[PDB]
Every structure is written in structure tokens, then in C-alpha cells.
């Protein structure tokens, strides 16, 4: 594989779409690679990690408990609720809802949690409170991944998302236990985690949350590194490409291959 930047450019050429990417040291925030890092991209399901960061902040403040059981109704369910549709009778705890939202991308779980933090406006206010003045959530699942061309709703930038994830995972804004919980939910991703491990060379750590939307929108927010360590945050978003999901996945994987082959930078 060629150098990361060369590969990213090649991916735009092949997809006919825009790619946004940041590679950042998790411990220090050092930015290693930045491409269209200040341009907007739909967050799609990647917003679920930020959502649960807001939930954990409420737990730390004593305003929420991960144990608290939420009971909901069938009429509350939206498209794609693999975990939540199974608990209409017994409900789910707030912690279970975050696990379902992050590890299974359960949309109803995400909407139930979104309501607890004040909806899209409440989550956006949380982002402003931690210093992210760019990322914004405007809608609920599943309308939020519509990805209309030029629509600023429900978007982030690679730089903002990377900085925000680092703040949630390491800045001590969240308690030690909460930081560890957010990380573990990403490590436990069932949608792409196992698949990514199956193609990663031995020794490479992966934790992640993916997203998909209309007009080719696709993305991933991840922790990656050799020697089984979460060394870097890697955020990659794609938008406005007519390519098959398989090809969008392959191009993102190709950027990862370039990082892996040329890690020491
Ligand atoms: O010399 C480095 C490595 O080169 C190859 O590894 C390949 C691997 O066989 C392939 O499957 C993967 O594809 C990349 C798979 C990446 C999947 C997702 C990455 C995510 C992670 C972070 C966010 C964005 C994307 O590339 C590597 C590097 O070329 C060799 O197979 C391996 O033995 C060797 O150690
Ligand atoms: C989050 O990104 C969700 C995107 N797509 C879903 C949606 O529009 O709500 C789908 C229902 C597909 O969902 C999945 O394929 C599961 C994994 C979603 C993820 O990557 O987080 S829609 O068909 O696009």
C-alpha cells in the first residue's frame, strides 16, 4: 500500500466522493494525518458513542444510573431494533441501552437514550459544554442519516469528532469508571469489530463504531494500534459517492492498510 495520504486521495478518485480523515495519538492529541479534517460529514451511527458519553456524564453527576430500567412500548420502536424489540415486556437498563446502541447500532435504544439527555438539542448542548463547537445533532433515528448534499444537519468534522472522542475517553471530564465503560462498549462492537479483526494482522488492537447513510455516506470512528494497544484514534468519513457498500468498505480498509504498513510517522 502507498502512504496514507496517497491512499486517501486514491479512494476519492475511485469513489468519486469526498473522504474526511484524521489520525491522532490518543494519549497526546498529536495529529498525524489530516485530510478535509475541517469539512462536514454526516455522523450517521457514529453519534451513538458521543450520546453515551453524555449519558455517562449524567451518571457521574448522580443524575442517572446505568442500572435504571427503562420500560418502553412497541409504538416507540423505529427501524432496526435488534435488541430493543426483544424487551418490550421487561425493559432495558440505561447501560444495556448504551451497549445496544454502540455494539449493535440499535436505533430505538439510541432514541430512548437521546430523550434522556434532552434530545438532539440536549446532545448538541453537551458537545458545546465539552468544547466541541462544530458537531451538531438535529434529528432522531433514523432520519439523521439522510445525508442530503450540502445539509449541515447531523454532521461533524473529522477533527472535531477525533478531539471529542479523545476528550470523552481520556480527559478526565468523565470519571475513571465511565471512561473505561465507554472504551469497553467500543471494544465490544458486534457490527464491524469481529470482521475488522479477521483482516487485521496479529497484534493490532481495534475498538470502533461504524455508520452508514444515504448517497454513499459511510464512516468509522476507531482506536487502533500495534502491540495490542489503543495507540491512535482514526476517524474516516465518506460522503457523496454512488459506490456499493462493499467498495466503500474496501476503500476504508485500504486506508487502514496504508496506516498499518506505514505506522511509524
Ligand atoms: O506488513 C504489514 C502487514 O501487511 C499485511 O497485512 C495486511 C492485511 O493482510 C490486510 O487484511 C489489511 O487490510 C486492512 C484491513 C483494515 C480494516 C479496517 C481498518 C479500520 C481501522 C481504523 C479506522 C479506519 C479503518 O492490511 C494489512 C496491511 O497491508 C500482511 O498480511 C501482514 O502479515 C503484515 O503484518
Ligand atoms: C447508523 O449508521 C445506521 C445506518 N444505517 C441504518 C439506518 O439507516 O438506521 C440501516 C437500518 C442499516 O443498519 C445497519 O446496517 C446496521 C449497522 C449500522 C451501523 O453501521 O451503525 S439502513 O439500511 O442504512
Automatic annotation (TrEMBL):
<dbReference type="InterPro" id="IPR012338">
    <property type="entry name" value="Beta-lactam/transpept-like"/>
</dbReference>
<dbReference type="InterPro" id="IPR000871">
    <property type="entry name" value="Beta-lactam_class-A"/>
</dbReference>
<dbReference type="InterPro" id="IPR023650">
    <property type="entry name" value="Beta-lactam_class-A_AS"/>
</dbReference>
<dbReference type="Pfam" id="PF13354">
    <property type="entry name" value="Beta-lactamase2"/>
</dbReference>
<feature type="domain" description="Beta-lactamase class A catalytic">
    <location>
        <begin position="24"/>
        <end position="237"/>
    </location>
</feature>
<keyword id="KW-0732">Signal</keyword>
<dbReference type="GO" id="GO:0046677">
    <property type="term" value="P:response to antibiotic"/>
</dbReference>
<protein>
    <recommendedName>
        <fullName>Beta-lactamase</fullName>
        <ecNumber>3.5.2.6</ecNumber>
    </recommendedName>
</protein>
<keyword id="KW-0614">Plasmid</keyword>
<dbReference type="GO" id="GO:0030655">
    <property type="term" value="P:beta-lactam antibiotic catabolic process"/>
</dbReference>
<comment type="similarity">
    <text>Belongs to the class-A beta-lactamase family.</text>
</comment>
<dbReference type="InterPro" id="IPR045155">
    <property type="entry name" value="Beta-lactam_cat"/>
</dbReference>
<keyword id="KW-0046">Antibiotic resistance</keyword>
<keyword id="KW-1015">Disulfide bond</keyword>
<dbReference type="GO" id="GO:0008800">
    <property type="term" value="F:beta-lactamase activity"/>
</dbReference>
<keyword id="KW-0378">Hydrolase</keyword>
Amino acid at each position: 500500500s502507498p502512504q496514507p495520504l496517497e491512499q486517501i486521495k486514491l479512494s476519492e478518485s475511485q469513489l468519486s466522493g469526498r473522504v474526511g480523515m484524521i489520525e491522532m495519538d490518543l494519549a497526546s492529541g498529536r495529529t498525524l494525518t489530516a485530510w478535509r479534517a475541517d469539512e462536514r460529514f454526516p455522523m450517521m451511527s457514529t453519534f451513538k458513542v458521543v450520546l453515551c458519553g453524555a449519558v455517562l456524564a449524567r451518571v457521574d453527576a448522580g443524575d442517572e444510573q446505568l442500572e435504571r430500567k427503562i420500560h418502553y412500548r412497541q409504538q416507540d420502536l423505529v427501524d432496526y431494533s435488534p435488541v430493543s424489540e426483544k424487551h418490550l415486556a421487561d425493559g432495558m437498563t440505561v447501560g444495556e441501552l448504551c451497549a445496544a446502541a454502540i455494539t449493535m447500532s440499535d436505533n430505538s435504544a439510541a432514541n430512548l437514550l437521546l430523550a434522556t439527555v434532552g434530545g438532539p438539542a440536549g446532545l448538541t448542548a453537551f458537545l458545546r459544554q465539552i468544547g466541541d463547537n462544530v458537531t451538531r445533532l438535529d434529528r432522531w433515528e433514523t432520519e439523521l442519516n439522510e445525508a442530503l448534499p450540502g445539509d449541515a444537519r447531523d454532521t461533524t468534522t473529522p477533527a472535531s469528532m477525533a478531539a471529542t472522542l479523545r476528550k470523552l475517553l481520556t480527559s478526565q471530564r468523565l470519571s475513571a469508571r465511565s471512561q473505561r465503560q465507554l472504551l469497553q462498549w467500543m471494544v465490544d462492537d458486534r457490527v464491524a469489530g469481529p470482521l475488522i479483526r479477521s483482516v487485521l494482522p496479529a497484534g493490532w488492537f481495534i475498538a470502533d463504531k461504524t455508520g452508514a447513510g444515504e448517497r454513499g455516506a459511510r464512516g468509522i470512528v476507531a482506536l487502533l494500534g500495534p502491540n495490542n494497544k489503543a495507540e491512535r484514534i482514526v476517524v474516516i468519513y465518506l460522503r457523496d459517492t454512488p459506490a456499493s457498500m462493499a467498495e466503500r468498505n474496501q476503500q476504508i480498509a485500504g486506508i487502514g492498510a496504508a496506516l498499518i504498513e506505514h505506522w511509524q510517522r
